[PDB]
Amino acid sequence: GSHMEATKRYLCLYLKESQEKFISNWKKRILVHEHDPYKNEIIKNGTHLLHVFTMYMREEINLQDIEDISKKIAQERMDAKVNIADFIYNTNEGKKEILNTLFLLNPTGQECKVVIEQINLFFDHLIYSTIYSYYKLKKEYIHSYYELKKKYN
Amino acid sequence: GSHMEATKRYLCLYLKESQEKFISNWKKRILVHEHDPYKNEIIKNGTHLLHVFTMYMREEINLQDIEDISKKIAQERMDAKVNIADFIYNTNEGKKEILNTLFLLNPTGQECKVVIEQINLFFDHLIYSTIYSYYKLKKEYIHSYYELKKKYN
Numbered sequence A, B: 001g002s003h004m005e006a007t008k009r010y011l012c013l014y015l016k017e018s019q020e021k022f023i024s025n026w027k028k029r030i031l032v033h034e035h036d037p038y039k040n041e042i043i044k045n046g047t048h049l050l051h052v053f054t055m056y057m058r059e060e061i062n063l064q065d066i067e068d069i070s071k072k073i074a075q076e077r078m079d080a081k082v083n084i085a086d087f088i089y090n091t092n093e094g095k096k097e098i099l100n101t102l103f104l105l106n107p108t109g110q111e112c113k114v115v116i117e118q119i120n121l122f123f124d125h126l127i128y129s130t131i132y133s134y135y136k137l138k139k140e141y142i143h144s145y146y147e148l149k150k151k152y153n
Ligand SMILES: CCCCCCCCCCC(=O)O
Pocket: A023, A026, A041, A042, A043, A045, A046, A047, A049, A050, A073, A076, A077, A087, A090, A091, A094, A095
């Protein structure tokens, strides 16, 4: 055969066709608290982000197109009153699994460079954007609902 | 020659011998605010973390051994009153540059898998740990210094 470049295409194909398995495996690794009121939104958001990821890899959306979902996640995490570091952990478990899948395609060093650099841009921006949004929302929350104790003013 | 495995060793060698160039380049890419009181600690911490990174790659320290510096950074970022997302951005610029260097060694797909997985563990844990610490410190700060406005209690 001709063996024409297909690493990105094959990654996206696997993540679409094996989605159930992928999400099931991710479920086994994430940090979720029993009393989190958005407990089941974590799975929904992760499923959606898997689709968004494949769209980004296929050059259909830009990094700015994940900023809305990043803000949505930040709001939900803030309302949940869970350590926002859980989100980083859970995102990283997802990325680790995407990379595990990439390496099963036996990419060359060059194919690694090109595909991994793009995977990195996506997850770096997801995490950056979500924490950025969380910070701003928390700042507004403190200003809205709290006041300094007299002892400190 | 025999061409015995040296990818990790060569990466660490470059980051030690070209440290000045590496930090200088990282300086051109980071987000730093003129009035940040720990402005110059960012460069000091980044220089130190480059050393810690090479120590981790050489199997001299564990991931738990970066938790103290993560907490130190979190405290400084909180005191600085800057968006904690800046830290994520700046860390990611550093990682991007480390990976750029790795790829200049022309690693194989296999060498990529092994070395990149370790680079990922380090930076994933640095970011996770620093945000984890920041969250806890902010929670304590709010409890210590603030009270709910009466309208909301
Ligand atoms: C395989 C999952 C891709 C990465 C998903 C990133 C975390 C989703 C955010 C979960 C939440 O809403 O807290």
